[PDB]
């Protein structure tokens, strides 16, 4: 059974100290003894600034059962730091939490600091990391805010190669075709070919970008990360809407739609209604863009009845 | 007042189309509007005068939510160690959500909720998720706490709000710690860097009257950069080397956006030159709306694009509406109603599949299918009143504030870290103070703008956009720190 650590001889010279939330505290949780015997002798590491090994092994111990814990990471990653341990041996044991499903925004956060303080000369091996991560959830948020991160620290330190953003946007693209529904992955994408600093704007990418983009909307028209990056795009470079119209119009009944339309593709759309409804707007004809909007509100997007008729009483 | 808020059973209910092309994304999808609908089907219309026979009753099932909650005043069991750096939230949750259900604590359970908060405050500045002998601070539970001593505490000298009086120095010198030049604030020591810190910090820095230039600067260029192109607002933004240019990290979210929509609106009130850095409002309203599931789905939120709906998302991104909304007035205005979300079909989510089966445990949740919590509870009830109660931040409300505002009245003021730090003189400072008063304190219900899905015995009481508390305890808390009356 379990040893408490009154009775070990490693711990023989510490008095813990007791949680002080007073005497009658509300929200009180039930802790098993192995977790209130760690925290106890936890308060009295932390009181006396302790940094040494066995303080090292009793954060482990506590983040096991409460990956959430900010103080004791806190602690850890300064007992790292201080004792000049091997950050590449807690990247491994990061690795292994994520493998164990122990998670939280710190573990997150602790592994993010472990990478700045490392400063790889080239990430690609954390990169690669990241990638196959994303197996048992391919939209986890904090992943993708950390590949996100991870690039763009990296990127400002002039460290990652147009060979390396190359193989990023061909694995973005390949996560697309497994799930074209995926908005973490067109998020992704948007950083990749618009936003990131270094990102290329001609020509040849605003042709080559659109068709993608289209692409992506004749093979499932009502994906709607596909019509919301579309919408984003020609906002973000000014570009007019009436000039795209053919390949949105089959919708509201340059890559053009699939002559017999796929299968289980109800029409209309409601975000090609939208499409057309601003196309009209940018043809200054308010009063067929109210048609639209109406229409919106009263038979095909119902459940946004009061948003779209909103729009609609701005035509006016 | 229901022209443009279509109930949930009177629409066609059908299936986000395949178009052909099976996803993961799609069978989860499916999977969630299986059940979600097969709930609805075997529940009572709200809306029917009678309800039908065989069926389940949808009525808000207050008594059943309050005993869920009552278990925070005597202990939890050991699974939530889990939330062991989270107590205030806890305390938050709970009493946040009696407050919304009408129920009233007794004075000596109100005084036990400050006195455990209190232990959780440090001397030299903030509160942790628990005793301040165990948790360093942490600009979440900060608010938290704050929170929940507005809704527990008063002015006598057992009532905690002295106390938060005489930490206010403190509480000012953490949060210019946690403040990094580009605008973003880590949420503790050595701790992570998003717009929830912003929020939160905002928030009480608002309601103790420590706000200053010092504090703000490149706060609101750090929360602009946030928003997406789908409209919403990412975790955070990134400086690249003041900087030459801020890139979102991430995709828009109904967490992220609630918390940038808040602080940005916040922003708004503070009187400095070219301040706050302008967002897309009518893009950020777009990206709301566009949340608002199917009927086949109850009309709840998601939280992001092609993910689920989740009770939660109602406080998250319903929450967020009035704020893009009022942010929309404004930019019309400069230049020179329906409601903008279904009302009635995110009452009828709340009602329908948010709530625990009846004769069980009680408590609110994310979906059919998974079990209640405190963190649910507050969110589906907090969305619910959103819902329930048309709220609009009212300029001749703010102007008439402003004409009561007595600036000869006030705590110390903070003493800034760096020492041209401050506000540049006594007008300029207590132009502030007035300004930022006199807006926290301009959200009204409307006027016959009420809609209670199922009956009057549905309704609970209002919350305040931005900050989720009731109003009634938001006044006299704030206008205790700013000396008012
Ligand atoms: C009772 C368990 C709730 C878990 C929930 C909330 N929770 C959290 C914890 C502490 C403070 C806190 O603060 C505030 F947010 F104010 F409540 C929030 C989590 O960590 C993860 N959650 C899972 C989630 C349930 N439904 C949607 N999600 C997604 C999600 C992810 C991160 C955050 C954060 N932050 C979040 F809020 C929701
Ligand atoms: C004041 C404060 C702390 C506000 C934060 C509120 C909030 C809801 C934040 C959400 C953050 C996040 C990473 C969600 C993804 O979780 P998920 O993948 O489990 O859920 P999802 O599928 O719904 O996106
Ligand atoms: O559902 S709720 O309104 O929260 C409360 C429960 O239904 C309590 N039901 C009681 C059962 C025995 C008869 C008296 C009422
Ligand atoms: O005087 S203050 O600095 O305000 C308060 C104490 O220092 C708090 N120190 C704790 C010790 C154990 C770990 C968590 C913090
Ligand atoms: O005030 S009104 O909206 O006209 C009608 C009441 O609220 C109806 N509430 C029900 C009464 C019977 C028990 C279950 C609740
Ligand atoms: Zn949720």
């Given at each position: 059974?379990?040893?408490p650590?009154?009775?070990?001889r490693?711990?023989?010279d510490?008095?813990?100290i007791?949680?002080?939330?007073?005497?009658?505290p509300?929200?009180p949780?039930?802790?098993?003894?192995?977790?209130?015997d760690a925290?106890?002798?936890?308060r009295a590491?932390?009181?006396?600034?302790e940094?040494?090994?066995?303080?090292?092994?009793?954060?482990e111990?506590?983040?096991?059962?409460?990956?959430?814990?900010?103080?004791?990471?806190?602690?850890?990653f300064?007992?790292l730091?201080?004792?000049n341990?091997?950050?590449?041996?807690?990247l491994?044991?990061?690795?292994?939490?994520?493998?164990q499903?122990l998670?939280?925004?710190?573990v997150?956060?602790?592994?993010l600091?472990?990478?700045?303080?490392?400063?790889p000369?080239?990430?690609?091996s954390?990169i690669?990391?990241?990638?196959g991560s994303?197996?048992p959830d391919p939209?986890?948020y904090?992943?993708?805010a950390?590949?996100?991160?991870?690039?763009?620290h990296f990127?400002t330190?002039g460290?990652i190669?147009?060979?390396?953003?190359?193989?990023?946007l061909?694995?973005?693209?390949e996560?697309?075709?497994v799930?074209?529904?995926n908005?973490?992955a067109?998020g992704?994408?948007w950083?990749?070919?618009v936003?990131?600093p270094?990102?290329?704007?001609?020509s040849?990418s605003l042709?080559d970008?659109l068709?993608?983009?289209?692409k992506?909307?004749?093979?499932?028209?009502?994906?709607?990360?596909?019509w919301?990056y579309?919408?984003g795009?020609?906002?973000?470079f000014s570009?007019?809407?009436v000039?795209?119209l053919?390949?949105?119009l089959?919708?509201t009944?340059?890559?053009?739609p699939?002559?017999p339309?796929?299968?289980?593709?109800?029409?209309?759309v409601?975000?090609?209604?939208?499409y057309?409804?601003?196309?009209?707007?940018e043809?200054?004809?308010?009063?067929?863009?109210?048609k639209?909007?109406?229409?919106?509100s009263?038979?095909?997007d119902?459940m946004r009845?009061?948003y779209?008729?909103?729009?609609r009483?701005?035509?006016? | 007042?229901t022209?443009?808020?279509?109930?949930?059973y009177?629409?066609?209910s059908?299936?986000?189309?395949?178009?052909?092309?099976?996803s993961?994304?799609?069978?989860?999808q499916?999977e969630?509007?299986?059940?979600?609908?097969?709930?609805?089907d075997?529940?009572?219309?709200?809306?029917?005068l009678?309800?039908?026979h065989?069926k389940?009753?949808?009525?808000?099932?207050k008594?059943?939510?309050?005993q869920?909650?009552?278990?925070?005043?005597?202990?939890?069991?050991?699974?939530f160690?889990?939330?062991?750096?989270?107590?205030p939230?806890?305390?938050?949750?709970?009493?946040?959500?009696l407050?919304?259900?009408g129920?009233?604590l007794?004075?000596?359970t109100?005084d036990?909720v400050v006195?455990?908060?209190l232990?959780?405050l440090?001397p030299?500045?903030?509160?942790?998720?628990?005793?301040a002998?165990?948790?360093i601070?942490?600009?979440?539970?900060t608010?938290a706490?704050?929170?929940?001593?507005?809704?527990a505490?008063?002015?006598s000298?057992?009532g905690?709000?002295?106390?938060?009086?005489?930490?206010?120095?403190?509480?000012?010198?953490?949060?210019?710690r946690?403040?990094?030049?580009?605008?973003?604030?880590?949420?503790?020591?050595?701790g992570?860097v998003?717009?929830?810190?912003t929020?939160?910090?905002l928030?009480?820095?608002?309601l103790l009257?420590?706000?200053t230039?010092?504090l703000?600067?490149?706060?609101?260029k750090?929360?602009?950069?946030?928003?997406?192109?789908?409209?919403?607002?990412?975790?955070?933004?990134?400086?690249?080397?003041?900087?030459?240019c801020?890139?979102s990290?991430?995709?828009?979210?109904?967490?992220?956006?609630?918390?940038?929509?808040?602080?940005?609106?916040?922003?708004?009130?503070?009187?400095?030159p070219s301040?706050p850095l302008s967002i897309d409002?009518?893009?950020?309203?777009?990206?709301t709306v566009?949340?608002?599931?199917?009927?086949?789905?109850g009309?709840?939120?998601?939280?992001?694009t092609?993910?689920l709906?989740?009770?939660c998302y109602?406080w998250?991104?319903?929450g967020?509406?009035?704020?893009a909304?009022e942010?929309?007035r404004?930019?019309k205005?400069?230049?020179?109603?329906?409601?903008?979300?279904?009302?009635v079909?995110?009452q009828e989510?709340?009602?329908v599949?948010?709530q625990?089966?009846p004769?069980s445990?009680?408590?609110l949740?994310?979906?059919?299918?998974?079990?209640?919590?405190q963190?649910?509870?507050?969110?589906n009830?907090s969305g619910?009143?959103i819902?329930?109660?048309?709220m609009?931040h009212?300029?001749?409300?703010?102007?008439?504030?402003?004409?009561?505002?007595?600036?000869?009245?006030?705590?110390?003021?903070?003493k800034?870290?760096?020492?041209g730090?401050?506000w540049?003189?006594?007008?300029?400072?207590?132009?502030?103070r007035?300004?930022?008063?006199?807006?926290?304190?301009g959200?009204?219900?409307?006027?016959?703008?009420?809609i209670?899905?199922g009956?009057?015995?549905?309704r609970?009481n209002?919350?305040?956009?931005?900050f989720?508390?009731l109003?009634?305890?938001?006044?006299?808390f704030?206008?205790?720190?700013?000396?008012?009356?």
């Amino acid at each position: 059974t379990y040893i408490p650590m009154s009775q070990r001889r490693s711990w023989a010279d510490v008095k813990p100290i007791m949680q002080d939330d007073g005497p009658n505290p509300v929200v009180p949780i039930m802790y098993s003894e192995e977790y209130k015997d760690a925290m106890d002798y936890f308060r009295a590491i932390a009181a006396k600034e302790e940094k040494s090994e066995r303080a090292l092994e009793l954060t482990e111990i506590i983040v096991r059962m409460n990956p959430a814990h900010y103080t004791v990471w806190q602690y850890r990653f300064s007992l790292l730091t201080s004792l000049n341990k091997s950050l590449e041996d807690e990247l491994r044991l990061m690795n292994e939490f994520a493998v164990q499903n122990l998670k939280s925004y710190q573990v997150w956060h602790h592994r993010l600091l472990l990478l700045d303080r490392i400063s790889p000369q080239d990430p690609v091996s954390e990169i690669e990391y990241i990638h196959g991560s994303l197996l048992p959830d391919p939209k986890n948020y904090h992943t993708w805010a950390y590949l996100h991160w991870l690039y763009s620290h990296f990127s400002t330190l002039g460290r990652i190669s147009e060979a390396q953003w190359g193989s990023e946007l061909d694995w973005c693209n390949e996560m697309l075709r497994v799930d074209g529904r995926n908005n973490s992955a067109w998020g992704w994408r948007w950083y990749l070919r618009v936003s990131r600093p270094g990102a290329e704007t001609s020509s040849r990418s605003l042709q080559d970008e659109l068709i993608y983009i289209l692409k992506s909307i004749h093979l499932i028209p009502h994906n709607v990360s596909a019509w919301n990056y579309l919408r984003g795009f020609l906002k973000h470079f000014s570009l007019p809407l009436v000039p795209i119209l053919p390949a949105i119009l089959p919708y509201t009944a340059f890559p053009m739609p699939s002559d017999p339309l796929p299968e289980d593709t109800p029409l209309p759309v409601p975000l090609a209604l939208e499409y057309l409804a601003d196309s009209f707007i940018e043809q200054n004809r308010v009063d067929d863009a109210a048609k639209v909007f109406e229409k919106l509100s009263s038979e095909y997007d119902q459940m946004r009845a009061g948003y779209w008729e909103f729009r609609r009483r701005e035509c006016a | 007042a229901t022209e443009f808020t279509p109930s949930v059973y009177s629409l066609v209910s059908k299936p986000l189309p395949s178009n052909s092309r099976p996803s993961a994304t799609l069978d989860e999808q499916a999977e969630t509007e299986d059940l979600i609908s097969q709930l609805f089907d075997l529940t009572a219309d709200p809306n029917a005068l009678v309800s039908e026979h065989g069926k389940r009753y949808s009525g808000l099932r207050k008594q059943e939510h309050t005993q869920f909650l009552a278990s925070s005043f005597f202990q939890l069991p050991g699974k939530f160690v889990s939330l062991d750096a989270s107590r205030p939230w806890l305390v938050f949750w709970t009493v946040h959500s009696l407050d919304l259900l009408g129920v009233a604590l007794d004075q000596g359970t109100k005084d036990r909720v400050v006195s455990t908060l209190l232990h959780f405050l440090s001397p030299k500045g903030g509160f942790g998720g628990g005793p301040a002998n165990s948790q360093i601070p942490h600009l979440l539970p900060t608010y938290a706490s704050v929170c929940s001593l507005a809704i527990a505490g008063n002015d006598s000298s057992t009532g905690g709000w002295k106390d938060l009086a005489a930490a206010r120095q403190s509480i000012y010198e953490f949060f210019m710690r946690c403040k990094r030049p580009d605008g973003g604030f880590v949420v503790c020591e050595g701790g992570e860097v998003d717009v929830r810190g912003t929020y939160c910090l905002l928030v009480v820095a608002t309601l103790l009257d420590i706000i200053t230039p010092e504090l703000l600067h490149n706060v609101d260029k750090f929360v602009s950069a946030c928003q997406t192109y789908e409209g919403g607002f990412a975790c955070a933004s990134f400086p690249f080397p003041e900087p030459s240019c801020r890139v979102s990290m991430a995709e828009a979210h109904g967490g992220y956006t609630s918390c940038s929509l808040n602080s940005h609106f916040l922003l708004t009130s503070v009187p400095l030159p070219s301040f706050p850095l302008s967002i897309d409002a009518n893009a950020a309203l777009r990206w709301t709306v566009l949340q608002q599931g199917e009927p086949i789905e109850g009309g709840g939120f998601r939280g992001r694009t092609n993910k689920l709906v989740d009770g939660c998302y109602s406080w998250w991104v319903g929450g967020g509406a009035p704020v893009a909304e009022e942010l929309v007035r404004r930019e019309k205005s400069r230049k020179v109603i329906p409601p903008i979300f279904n009302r009635v079909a995110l009452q009828e989510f709340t009602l329908v599949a948010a709530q625990q089966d009846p004769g069980s445990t009680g408590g609110l949740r994310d979906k059919p299918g998974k079990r209640p919590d405190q963190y649910h509870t507050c969110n589906n009830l907090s969305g619910l009143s959103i819902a329930q109660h048309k709220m609009s931040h009212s300029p001749s409300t703010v102007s008439s504030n402003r004409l009561k505002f007595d600036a000869s009245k006030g705590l110390p003021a903070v003493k800034p870290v760096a020492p041209g730090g401050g506000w540049k003189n006594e007008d300029e400072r207590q132009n502030a103070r007035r300004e930022i008063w006199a807006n926290a304190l301009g959200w009204i219900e409307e006027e016959g703008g009420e809609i209670i899905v199922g009956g009057k015995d549905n309704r609970i009481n209002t919350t305040t956009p931005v900050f989720n508390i009731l109003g009634l305890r938001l006044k006299p808390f704030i206008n205790y720190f700013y000396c008012q009356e």
